[PDB]
Amino acid sequence: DIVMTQSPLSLPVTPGEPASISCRSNQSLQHSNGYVHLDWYRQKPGQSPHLLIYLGFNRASGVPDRFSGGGSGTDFTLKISRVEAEDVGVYYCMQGLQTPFTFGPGTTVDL
Amino acid sequence: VCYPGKFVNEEALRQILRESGGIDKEAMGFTYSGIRTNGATSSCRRSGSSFY
Amino acid sequence: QVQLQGSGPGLLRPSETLSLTCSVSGVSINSYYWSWVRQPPGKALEWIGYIYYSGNTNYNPSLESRVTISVDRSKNQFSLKMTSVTAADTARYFCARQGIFGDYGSDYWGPGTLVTVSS
Ligand SMILES: *[C@@H]1O[C@H](CO)[C@@H](O)[C@H](O)[C@H]1NC(C)=O
Give C36-81 as a DSSP string: EEE--TTS--EEEEEE-SSS-EEEBTTB-TTEEE---SSSSB--EE
**Cβ–Cβ < 8 Å for C110, C94:** yes
C-alpha to C-alpha distance for C111 and C95, rounded to whole angstroms: 7
Other CB atoms within 10 A of residue C71 CB: 15
Q: Is the peptide bond before A100 cis (omega within 30 degrees of 0)?
A: yes
Bridge partners for A92 per DSSP: A41
> Closest approach of chain A CAs to the CA of B25, in angstroms?
24
Residue nearest to atom 8 of ligand 1 (CA): A2
Chain B residues whose beta carbon lies within 8 Å of the beta carbon of residue C2:
31
Q: What share of chain A is helix, strand, coil (3-state, %, to 5)?
A: 5, 45, 55
Asked if B31 has any chain C CB less than 8 Å from its own CB, the reply is yes
Q: Are strands C67-69 and C57-59 parallel, antiparallel or unpaired?
A: unpaired
Bridge partners for C7 per DSSP: C21
- Ligand 1 centre from A99 Cα, in Å? 13
- Ligand 1 centre from A27 Cα, in Å? 8
Residue type, B32: Y
Q: Is residue A28 in contact with ligand 1, taking CB distance under 6 Å?
A: no
Cα radius of gyration (chain C) = 14
Sign of CA dihedral A52, A58, A62, A66: positive
**Cβ–Cβ < 8 Å for C29, C76:** yes
Q: Is residue A27 in contact with ligand 1, taking CB distance under 6 Å?
A: yes
What CA–CA distances, in Å, run from C59 to A15, A25, A98, C52, C84?
A: 41, 21, 11, 12, 17
C-alpha to C-alpha distance for A66 and C73, rounded to whole angstroms: 41
Asked if A62 has any chain B CB less than 8 Å from its own CB, the reply is yes
C-alpha to C-alpha distance for C78 and C22, rounded to whole angstroms: 6
Backbone region of residue A40 per phi and psi (left: phi > 0; alpha: psi in -120 to 50; beta: other values): beta
Among partner residues B26, B27, B32, which is closest to C105 by beta-carbon distance? Answer: B32
Q: What is the resolution of this structure in A?
A: 3.7
What CA–CA distances, in Å, run from B15 to B2, B6, B7, C103?
A: 21, 16, 13, 31
**C-beta atoms of C109 and A49 within 8 A:** yes
- Secondary structure class of B10 (helix, strand, coil): helix
**C-beta atoms of B29 and C27 within 8 A:** yes
Buried b (16+ CB within 10 A) or exposed e, B25-48: eeeebebeeeeeeeeeeeeeeeee
Residue nearest to atom 13 of ligand 1 (CA): A27
**Cβ–Cβ < 8 Å for A8, A22:** yes
**Cβ–Cβ < 8 Å for C63, C69:** no
Binding partners of B (≥3 Cβ pairs within 8 A) = A, C
- What distance lies between CA C87 and its chain's CA centroid? 18
Residue of C nearest to B36 (CA): C1
What was the experiment behind these coordinates? cryo-EM
